[PDB]
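ERR on first pass: missing label on line 2. Operator R.T. fixed the label and resubmitted. Corrected input:
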Amino acid sequence: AKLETVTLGNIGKDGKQTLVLNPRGVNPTNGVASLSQAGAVPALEKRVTVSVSQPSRNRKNYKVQVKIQNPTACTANGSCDPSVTRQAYADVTFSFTQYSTDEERAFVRTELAALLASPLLIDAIDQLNPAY
Amino acid sequence: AKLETVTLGNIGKDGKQTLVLNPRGVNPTNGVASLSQAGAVPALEKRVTVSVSQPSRNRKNYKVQVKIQNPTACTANGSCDPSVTRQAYADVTFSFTQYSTDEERAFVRTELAALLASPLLIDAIDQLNPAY
Amino acid sequence: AKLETVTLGNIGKDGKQTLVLNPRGVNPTNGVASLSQAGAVPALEKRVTVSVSQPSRNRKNYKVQVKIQNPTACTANGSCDPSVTRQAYADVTFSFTQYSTDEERAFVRTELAALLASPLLIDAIDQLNPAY
Amino acid sequence: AKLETVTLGNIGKDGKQTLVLNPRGVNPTNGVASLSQAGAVPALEKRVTVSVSQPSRNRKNYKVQVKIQNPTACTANGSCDPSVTRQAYADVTFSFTQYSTDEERAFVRTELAALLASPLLIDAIDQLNPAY
Amino acid sequence: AKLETVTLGNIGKDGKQTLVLNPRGVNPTNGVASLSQAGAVPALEKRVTVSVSQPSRNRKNYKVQVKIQNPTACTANGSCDPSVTRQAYADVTFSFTQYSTDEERAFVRTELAALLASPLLIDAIDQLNPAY
Amino acid sequence: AKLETVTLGNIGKDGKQTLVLNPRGVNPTNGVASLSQAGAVPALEKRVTVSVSQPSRNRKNYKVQVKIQNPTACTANGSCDPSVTRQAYADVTFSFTQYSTDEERAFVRTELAALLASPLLIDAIDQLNPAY
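pass 2 clean. output:
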């Protein structure tokens, strides 16, 4: 949704950390807005991208795609321009019919939050553990 | 990580609960967990599909994926059987390297909940709003 | 203007009804602001959009444009979902010059509203009966 | 819509201008109705015209157009004869199906008048920002 | 960055103040802010515009572009209408890598302000004195 | 214009650094003034240059172009002579009317120094923040 500064709080393993995302403008060729960690160096700024578009004159379906891109740096090592290794992503899409109501959309999204917050997935992602 | 009955909810758009997903029917030929309301009516119900993958020589990385299915059923005139008409879906893929920490994964996980709860996404689908 | 949940009132045949148009972002490929009916049915939503460029791009004007779509819909008996059977449209274009006065522009805007109120257009539109 | 002298009020930024335009008949070669200003010089007059199209061969709907024109002129450079200088005008069209609802024909007309009063359009033509 | 009304003192030979440029939106197709003192008759108005570009195929750098638009108009010197006859402007481009720190981006920013305030540019720009 | 030793105090993101630039002169191939950072060659490379173009016989349009570059030196372990990364730079041009006054030009020169000095550019440049 609208670009502005976005604060993500109550995050990390303890659920106590915060991250502030500065907005970045929209690339009209794909309709993608971007936000990133409000740090000094882009090479290591965690990124969030939006996306979010109306049903097309082909197959309809309201669709979104939301990405998380999280880089890390090491010693450098020996470089004055530190190398970057991506450690992790998320790529979340949604698809809704043109007749979909607010509650269908809200439940798919808040179910995802409720589900990721379930120990089944908390542990599966923190561990990279299949559920059994 | 561990299969358990999932009684998710509290925050639909109206502050209502959505349940219950029974983690039963795990697919043994791809190792994919199956969470569902489908136990009552498999043709017309809500499901969550959960998979985790370990690295091999053809990828050398880790994957976590959750698929959310929320079909809506209706009985058309002349039918004695409701069928799915309107539908809503979501699909999230996460990916990690072998040097990825649990702390970074927790950030990707918790940042996503923060994003799902944040106006950045509770507008993007609910108000059908692109980033303006 | 800034997209807002715009409420119109004193509208329709008796001049007594209302309509709420919610922000749906702007189209990023042409910078056109868009609102649509608040009710959650994208398939059949009423739409209003606004374009306000200046002469640089086309070395001309640029005329201000407002687009209106009213996709009148009806549910066939026995259908689970309504569809558009008739549509009404409007395209309102106003002149602009980089050297024009804001008062001149207001004169035309308000003149149009006064004309829409005038019986000459009430018949040109309600009957589809052009002036004679 | 019989042409009659129109005496409009509520015109301009503060709604304090009025405008009176007298019938000049209808041009039967294109079906265009016209109301004139009492000024002597055609190039210097304010005027309104009306035209409605119809379904026909290669035409699917009725198109209702009103032309609003308000030239601005002055005795530039000391001229004994004033001239335009500025063209403040609007091309406003509506279109309807032959099976359309009269209530809806009224709504698009009245919705536009309501939209014209609303910040959404008053700034769009009198003084608006790109979009936003 | 986030738009605000900008109140700039110390402008011109005597340090005349205050020049006030209000946030009068952002062009959605290219991220361009438009600041202005009034905007009623744009040709005759003073403006500053700003955008930030991201790297893409073609260029690996991040860019910040600021443009200053200050046309000078003549009053209605018998013409009965003011117009632009002379103009000054600036087109200011900054470019940075993914490894640039904020500290460094700021040197280019503050060095330029410090240089603009220095005799080398006071003479190069105000008297158009040649290099020597 | 005329070259002198230039000291730029109160620079960088905290406004605390002082830079001393030693003029070298004007390169006769293109008439471009140059100021070098007053140390080792890799530091000297962090040059500021000025091109003052008098209105051309075939264009008129005076132009003053200021180029700022700041390559960052880095020596690898086992190396001596550092390589540099052109992490940050700018290219700024002032123009154009041959009939403009020193005040019109000073207005633009100082307007930019005042903008570079303002929160919008402090953030637009130091953290690459968009017009949000």
